[PDB]
Ligand binder design. Structure first.
Ligand SMILES: *[C@@H]1O[C@H](CO)[C@@H](O[C@@H]2O[C@H](CO)[C@@H](O[C@@H]3O[C@H](CO[C@H]4O[C@H](CO)[C@@H](O)[C@H](O)[C@@H]4O)[C@@H](O)[C@H](O[C@H]4O[C@H](CO)[C@@H](O)[C@H](O)[C@@H]4O[C@H]4O[C@H](CO)[C@@H](O)[C@H](O)[C@@H]4O)[C@@H]3O)[C@H](O)[C@H]2NC(C)=O)[C@H](O)[C@H]1NC(C)=O
Ligand SMILES: *[C@@H]1O[C@H](CO)[C@@H](O[C@@H]2O[C@H](CO)[C@@H](O[C@@H]3O[C@H](CO[C@H]4O[C@H](CO)[C@@H](O)[C@H](O)[C@@H]4O)[C@@H](O)[C@H](O[C@H]4O[C@H](CO)[C@@H](O)[C@H](O)[C@@H]4O[C@H]4O[C@H](CO)[C@@H](O)[C@H](O)[C@@H]4O)[C@@H]3O)[C@H](O)[C@H]2NC(C)=O)[C@H](O)[C@H]1NC(C)=O
Ligand SMILES: *[C@@H]1O[C@H](CO)[C@@H](O[C@@H]2O[C@H](CO)[C@@H](O[C@@H]3O[C@H](CO[C@H]4O[C@H](CO)[C@@H](O)[C@H](O)[C@@H]4O)[C@@H](O)[C@H](O[C@H]4O[C@H](CO)[C@@H](O)[C@H](O)[C@@H]4O[C@H]4O[C@H](CO)[C@@H](O)[C@H](O)[C@@H]4O)[C@@H]3O)[C@H](O)[C@H]2NC(C)=O)[C@H](O)[C@H]1NC(C)=O
Ligand SMILES: *[C@H]1O[C@H](CO)[C@@H](O)[C@H](O)[C@H]1O
Ligand SMILES: *[C@H]1O[C@H](CO)[C@@H](O)[C@H](O)[C@H]1O
Ligand SMILES: *[C@H]1O[C@H](CO)[C@@H](O)[C@H](O)[C@H]1O
Lengths: 365, 365, 365
């Protein structure tokens, strides 16, 4: 018969999911950013430019004001419109003569007389073109990795766990278990050898696996605990939908008090643990201790949740069980993010190198 | 006594292995390829070359035909033989004058009068030499990562699971359990506290851990299931070797219906799960529920598989148990592949950058 | 009641920790080193330099002796002091004229007459400056990844497992279980629903979870084994602290005979397994089978270890349980090491590329 601690294995696997929710899942690493370095290289290039080039960025009436492109349209026989935004950003502080001199000193160009500045400028123009070319990576720009944020991943985790973008508070305010579909009795809610559960997310699955009820506190209702049953008072034959107080008595078995570093490997391992614990039968697969007939909570029956999407003839948990597929999608996005972090480190290092060379007076000559 | 669900933990660990077999294990990422970019850079260089250089690639009698190296041997006072294959590949489409002009336009060289083309050619020759140098990585070329394919890894997984290059069909056609060595009774086949099993692969281990037999359908034969026993009808005291129908009734407890993204971390975690479930004793280590004496299938005995290669005094599963060592070898090859993917991303980005610069008329001048 | 094999799950999780100790944990990959290549590039540059530059590195009285900087101080109107150590290292073998000629040949410079050597030298000086700039990565230099060694990580693992820098031998010489704090009886040592254990490390936790004692050899003392109890003879009501012989009878359930490839993912998975097996109650969390009251070793009580740092209202194992936090710190250091390996591969490839170009006579011209 099912008794104290018999579902510790399944509780551990499901709490490995629940612990990821809320705002607890955190990315190891942000995508490398090198815009600062690119902007500095472009500004250094503008600082080294001939005065007549910087003058193109000035208003014709006030040399300290940036050129207005309605007042002074860009010539259509050039490609200047293709580059103006970046050039104007580099030029803006330099329109002030004192700031231009301060930038000359910052970039180690202030010691150069005209012919030596021309020599340096030739190298700088080459280095700057190389920086712009290297800072392009069409395989990352606008990709999944670039468009996906940590907040986006957290919301998707909360969708898998709670069917909501945010984790319910300790009273489960705003949340209705089983999507409002609970009815009849525990085995109707949690499933059986022939029918699936009404649980669409991980938290309601955990509730089916671990909640005590009015009739099993002496035995099966201790399946997920050490000694004291959770004490939900759930009475699904009378009131099918558990209250928020009941849900929280089960959620507090899980680690909701810290953070988790999001990695694809960490999600993969958690999904593999849950997925392979599913016991495949002819019409359903069962998560949790099961001895006979259904997941009714009786010590001779089961403390479990059942799925019809996966059986001994069909189905893959991470594709066919919606909440698991949602988390697998997070895994895939993390794989893309991790590859983008590796790839973007290259232009980051390249641009730091170029800035070093561009500030090296001997190299420039 | 051993009863329903008592081996769910061990079944889950072993099905985590079986699910990798067939063609289900898939690489996250192919090795970055940059041959397209290198070939384009070499072709651009040939397009920019002086006409007398391209003429070296022509037959002396028909200028549209590539030079034949028996008819017109390469001069031995040059290094041309060291480079001819790549040069001739770049030159081949360009031998047609109209195609040469089309390539000049494709590569943004068609606007250049002779002196400006010479200036551009100087930069292109430098960029092309840099591309060739960067496209070399002797630490990846001909390495394990380069020589190992996804098909190779799948075959090695199937060797660990089935001792075959391909996964047996649903009737286990062509397969003989226990390498034909099963005899006597279940405990002889599956092992004991004093002797090892006849199972050399993971599928036959799973069979020992999870198969019901004629005498345990009411009890221990339900160790891996929820309710209904698998129904093999195995009768090893009369006919020791199980049939393909019997094997499939156990294999269908595992997820053979989807795919798995092969990563070193995913294999490591699966091997660590199995390896640490091995219960080390004085003469054997046991995988599966075990109460007394041997893995006979009796509810008072064990539903398990035993190994003599690992004990409480010696042995490491991933080195000393052949099927686990075969999968650990896959893990090692995946680590090398993953490092090669990271390393090859560098020349890939470098060559894309060079192509950008080589097609930039302002940079070339 | 707790009996044979009931703690196999918890033993497996804890042995996944113990197996990392000793010197068994090994890094997949050393940080890429490119000092050899940088040194070669600097030496090639010095080999190509004009004789009057190499002469700056000679003693004024013996041209085969390196310049002494007290005898011949460096001019303060130069930056030579900022570069002297690297230059002098490059110059040292070259002070011998025959060795200088041998290096000219090694670096493919010996075919160059003066004007062609000057042309090559211009390119070499540029390539060498680029190599120096690329070989800088301030995000790795003196970072956690750079300062952390494999020995350092092994010692930290042994601190988590044993509270010592090195793993105790097979007699546990030099080791005292429970930090010398064991007293009274098993439940005082191992904890309960109301009090924490005296175990501060993973090995003593494993002892609480898996040791038999004088009164449970027929039942609960078999929780971690297959058949034969460990046979410690522990009698904590009389002599609380177990002996080294007793500790070794439990440690030998774990894989202490092989090696483990240290990765952040491998540690993360092991910590997640242990952490989520902790059964959270009102005043303590319990690792191990637990039926009633305390971890006394009685078959009706528990074979377990308790922690007050984590409960159903507070605490995260990898932050608040010291031994788990120590191992989580290893995970974090491994993440930094793994990122440094990826990042340092870039300058490694860059410097190999530069060496190739610098030894290419056609490129240099
Ligand atoms: C780092 O800092 C440097 C400055 O030190 C900065 O350099 C500037 O780069 C830009 C972009 O490469 C250069 O832009 C070119 O400008 C010329 C000159 O335009 C003026 O003078 C002409 C001639 O008198 C006038 O007609 C014109 O109205 C302007 O007054 C333009 O001629 C260039 O445009 C042609 O070439 C481009 C390709 O390079 C084409 O994309 C473009 O469509 C134009 O082609 C057309 O005209 C061609 C005539 O030769 C013809 O051949 C084509 O068929 C077609 O009809 C171009 O816009 C600018 O001169 C540089 N400034 C200086 C002072 O040198 C770098 O940009 C900066 N680096 C970075 C990365 O920001
Ligand atoms: C991008 O596109 C460019 C073209 O724009 C292309 O350039 C070609 O590169 C190759 C390889 O670097 C150059 O090959 C050289 O060719 C010369 C000339 O050979 C002809 O003329 C000589 C003299 O009249 C004849 O003797 C000969 O029979 C040919 O008719 C060769 O002299 C070169 O070989 C020597 O130098 C090499 C090192 O660079 C040695 O490896 C080789 O063994 C040779 O050395 C021998 O002779 C030397 C004489 O100087 C002597 O010093 C040595 O001791 C030894 O005895 C070399 O083969 C070719 O000229 C380029 N073409 C043009 C038009 O410039 C790039 O290859 C392409 N980029 C890529 C990456 O594909
Ligand atoms: C690869 O191999 C090459 C050799 O082929 C090697 O090149 C050497 O590089 C170093 C470092 O860049 C060069 O060092 C410079 O040396 C000059 C010359 O000093 C002598 O001659 C002067 C003039 O007669 C004397 O005054 C002096 O006492 C020496 O006899 C120095 O003038 C340079 O120092 C000034 O410029 C530096 C910036 O580049 C400043 O950091 C430094 O503070 C100095 O500035 C001061 O003086 C300036 C005068 O112009 C003035 O403008 C400033 O305001 C300030 O007052 C510098 O030390 C050396 O010449 C190169 N050797 C050759 C033969 O070319 C590469 O180093 C090597 N590559 C690598 C990476 O190792
Ligand atoms: C589950 O199975 C038990 C044992 O047969 C039965 O008593 C319950 O009614 C059922 O839900
Ligand atoms: C396994 O152990 C049981 C219990 O003692 C015994 O009945 C079987 O014969 C043996 O194989
Ligand atoms: C643990 O619980 C059992 C069962 O009530 C009791 O007999 C022991 O004394 C206690 O330590």
């Amino acid at each position: 018969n099912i008794g104290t601690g018999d579902n510790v294995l399944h509780r551990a696997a499901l709490c490995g999911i629940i612990e990821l929710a809320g705002k607890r899942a955190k990315l190891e690493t942000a995508l490398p950013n090198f815009q600062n370095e690119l902007n500095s290289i472009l500004e250094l290039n503008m600082t080294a430019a001939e005065p007549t080039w910087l003058d193109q960025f000035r208003d014709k009436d006030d040399r300290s004001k940036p050129r207005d492109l309605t007042k002074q349209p860009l010539p259509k026989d050039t490609n200047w419109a293709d580059h103006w935004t970046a050039w104007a950003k580099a030029a803006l502080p330099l329109l002030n003569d004192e700031t231009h001199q301060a930038k000359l000193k910052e970039y180690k160009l202030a010691g150069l007389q005209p012919e030596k500045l021309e020599r340096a400028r030739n190298t700088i123009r080459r280095l700057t073109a190389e920086a712009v070319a290297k800072a392009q990576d069409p395989t990352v720009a606008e990709s999944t990795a670039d468009l996906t944020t940590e907040e986006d991943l957290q919301k998707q985790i909360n969708q898998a766990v709670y069917s909501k973008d945010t984790e319910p508070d300790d009273d489960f305010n705003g949340y209705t278990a089983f999507e409002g579909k609970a009815s009849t009795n525990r085995q109707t809610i949690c499933g059986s050898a022939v029918a699936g559960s009404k649980a669409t997310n991980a938290m309601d699955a955990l509730f089916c696996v671990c909640a005590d009820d009015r009739t099993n506190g002496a035995d099966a209702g201790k399946a997920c605990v050490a000694g004291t049953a959770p004490g939900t008072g759930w009475n699904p034959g009378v009131t099918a939908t558990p209250t928020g107080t009941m849900l929280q008595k089960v959620r507090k078995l899980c680690n909701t008090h810290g953070k988790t570093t999001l990695s694809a490997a960490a999600i993969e391992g958690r999904l593999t643990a849950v997925g392979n614990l599913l016991t495949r039968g002819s019409a359903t697969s069962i998560l949790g201790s099961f001895l006979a007939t259904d997941c009714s909570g009786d010590q001779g029956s089961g403390m479990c949740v059942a799925y019809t999407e996966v059986t001994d003839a069909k189905g893959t948990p991470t594709k066919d069980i919606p909440w698991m597929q949602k988390l697998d999608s997070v895994r895939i996005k993390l794989q893309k993010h991790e590859r983008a972090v590796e790839k973007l480190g290259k232009p980051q290092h390249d641009l730091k190198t170029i800035l070093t060379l561009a500030k090296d007076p001997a190299y420039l000559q």
